[PDB]
Amino acid sequence: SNMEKHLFNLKFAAKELSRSAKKCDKEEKAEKAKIEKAIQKGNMEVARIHAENAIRQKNQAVNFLRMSARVDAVAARVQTAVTMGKVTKSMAGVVKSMDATLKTMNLEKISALMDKFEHQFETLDVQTQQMEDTMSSTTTLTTPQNQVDMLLQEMADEAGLDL
Template identity: 45%
Template structure:
């Protein structure tokens, strides 16, 4: 009998996911190089996640065939492989998402670094303008300084915000659940798991209370009408 092969997750990247080493001979890798490598790695993680999804579905088909053949042991093996592929696929997607987040932060940090270099250059120009006491040159240099400070403030705010998002769970659970419900409704799907209902707002509660009062009053009026001779 043909031996069934179980999928094993060793914690290492599976075959097909390669590392990236773009450093040239004797040259130190720049931040731009690191950003490019992370982008490429994130894309490859996404591709690997897609492969896992395909393998997951393929294993489910094998489960169906094994059950039809009455082979319980083989069905269990394929079921385990399907679940393992699903979990690995989710892990690759999470890694890809984290890499994308790091790329954004590195790009912002790199922009600030480049901005700092340009400010050093502007400072030298200012020194030259002050030495010559050229009013027009000094005014133009001050305009450049102010523009650079505005851009630096914007980039610093963006970087600070990205750090906060990375360190805190900014995506709320109810947002995720609402999106899942929305997708399910759009495709007329019935979700087979419990969802935490979003808390009703004050207006919704008041409306329900009013409807209940109206129903009770209507019932009371009908009872009174029956009691009248």
């Protein structure tokens, strides 16, 4: 997109400004060096000239740094905007999908299903209670309670516990 091309352009510009500042700095160092080497020999005017050069380079480095920083702020705002746009896209997609889902499914279906589940489980509980009652009524002779109590007492004494 134009956004991406412009981001590349801004990154290139920032890198170029940084490199220009670096060059200005190296040049300032070299000029200061030459100033030393010249003054060590008794040169005033050369010193003045190189000093003016260094001042110019410093001012220009500062200006490049300011401009680079401003450009960086702008690029950052742009990235923020692009990210927000991606987010808006994703969110609109989610809106479409969720609206579709809510159109398909509703709450009355849920309530009906749950009321059913309740009734079916109630009927099942009734059936299980009936089965329990019947199967317990069938099995009554071949398990007296006295024998069970005696066995329980015996096995509890064997294990070493009381009931």
